[PDB]
Design a protein around this ligand. Structure first.
Ligand SMILES: Nc1ccn([C@H]2C[C@H](O)[C@@H](COP(=O)(O)OP(=O)(O)OP(=O)(O)O)O2)c(=O)n1
Ligand SMILES: [Ca+2]
Ligand SMILES: [Ca+2]
Length: 424
DNA sequence: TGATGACGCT
DNA sequence: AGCGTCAT
């Protein structure tokens, strides 16, 4: 009763760019705007592997992890943009720079946690308190939430009509008299996220979606409910009905083996069904941490903090060498390690200038024909010849080949990663 | 025929 | 340390 915590203490948002690499290329090439289009890496195997797809192309059934040649069979007029290729590999710099544009805008509003190249969490709790104080108690107009969905509402045959009826039901029952109402706090949060999304679009050209809720898992789930170019508020109150038919795999961290295990062992399908189990039962099946997390999460409660981190903690680059293209000579392994090391050196030097830090450890990881081995060594100089030589040094005993000159068994992946940053 | 990045476990 | 899971 009076002592049951309800996970309503924070206002958390997740902001995710719509079809992000596609928008970067459409911004640059207006001919691609408002068209079915995709971004592809490489070009020679089946037209290239699709890694991002515009919403217009999705309407034809085009997805990522399709080959371009196959996507063209579903969508003959599909337009393509190719990822930059440098030193014989895909080069994601354009997308990393576009990412910085968006992250730097978000950070003007609140401290952010960079979750991927195109999304970030935001803890808006303080910003909301402030805005609430700034508002004497004026009601919140629907005009301040022009792209917001209230999950579970309403209670019209056009999508925008539904959106508005839902929003009206929400605002008409909101208690503005109480500065401590969690629902009021989420609503103000959504006003701020409208402002943040407007600034991102105005200053970059990019559209995004967002989720606003009381923790990161519900914000992330909320974000995906109305895409593209919209945002979704998931209140604590909305959780029982939302979770009652929500497959377990949709919740962040449950989309893999653990979630599969929850479904198999407990004989359930939906997040809501977890409420029937004691915390001890879940801990017994899935371990102390996972069981506690599940017990709370199925009730809409999660305490994972928005971490104050807007820069990546590692800088890496890798290349696959599949099938017949696997690396089978030593000079080959050396040459690719050098290409990787050269890209890594460029990115590290840039990073050192921009962000006042230096990496101190080099991780080298490989795969053998059908992840292989990982070995580390000191990163003491941003020098590509030295890093590639050192990477070779620590992986060279992997070679079972006796008289070579040669590399057995052939290498199907190479990976260099700079880590353990210190201030500089 | 893919290229990344964060974090948990022992 | 090195390996594994989960995700974009
Ligand atoms: N397996 C993946 C998934 C994504 N990306 C890249 C291309 C995407 O544009 C970008 C962001 O990934 P998202 O999963 O957020 O997908 P999009 O932003 O492309 O689409 P959505 O609008 O559905 O978020 O990261 C990638 O290289 N490999
Ligand atoms: Ca996205
Ligand atoms: Ca994303």
């Amino acid at each position: 009763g009076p002592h049951m915590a309800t996970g309503q203490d924070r206002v958390v948002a997740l902001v995710d760019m719509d079809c992000f690499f596609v928008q970067v290329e459409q911004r640059q090439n207006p001919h691609l705007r408002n068209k079915p289009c995709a971004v592809v890496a490489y070009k020679s195997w089946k037209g290239g592997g699709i890694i991002a797809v515009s919403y217009e192309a999705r309407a034809f059934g085009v997805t990522a992890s399709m080959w371009a040649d196959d996507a063209k069979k579903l969508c003959p007029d599909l337009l393509l943009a190719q990822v930059r290729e440098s030193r014989g590999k895909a080069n994601l710099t354009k997308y990393r720079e576009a990412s910085v544009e968006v992250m730097e805008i978000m950070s003007r509003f609140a401290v952010i946690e960079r979750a991927s190249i195109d999304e970030a969490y935001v803890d808006l709790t303080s910003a909301v308190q402030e805005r609430l104080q700034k508002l004497q108690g004026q009601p919140i107009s629907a005009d301040l939430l022009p792209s917001t969905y209230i999950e579970g509402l309403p209670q019209t045959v056009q999508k925008e009509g539904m959106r508005k009826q839902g929003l009206f039901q929400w605002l008409d029952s909101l208690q503005i008299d109480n500065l401590t109402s969690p629902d009021l706090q989420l609503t103000v949060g959504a006003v701020i996220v409208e402002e943040m999304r407007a600034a991102i679009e105005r200053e970059t050209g990019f559209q995004c979606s967002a989720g606003i809720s009381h923790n990161k898992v519900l914000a992330k789930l909320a974000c995906g409910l109305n895409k593209p170019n919209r945002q979704t508020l998931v209140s604590h109150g909305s959780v029982p009905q939302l979770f009652s038919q929500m497959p377990i795999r949709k919740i962040r961290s449950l989309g893999g083996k653990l979630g599969a295990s929850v479904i198999e062992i407990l004989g359930i399908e939906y997040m809501g069904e977890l409420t029937q189990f004691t915390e001890s039962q879940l801990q017994s099946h899935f371990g102390e941490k996972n069981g506690s997390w599940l017990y709370a999460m199925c009730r809409g409660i999660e305490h994972d903090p928005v971490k104050p981190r807007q820069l990546p903690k590692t800088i890496g680059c890798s290349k696959n060498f599949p099938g017949k293209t696997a690396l089978a000579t030593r000079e080959q392994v050396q040459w690719w390690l050098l290409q990787l090391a050269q890209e890594l050196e460029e990115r590290l030097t840039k990073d050192r200038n921009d962000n006042d830090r230096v990496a101190t450890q080099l991780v080298v990881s490989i795969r053998v024909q059908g992840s292989s081995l990982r070995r580390c060594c000191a990163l003491t100089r941003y020098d590509a010849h030295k890093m590639s030589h050192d990477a070779f040094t620590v992986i060279k005993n992997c070679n079972t080949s006796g008289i070579q000159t040669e590399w057995s068994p052939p290498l199907t992946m190479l990976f260099l990663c700079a880590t353990k940053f210190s201030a500089s």
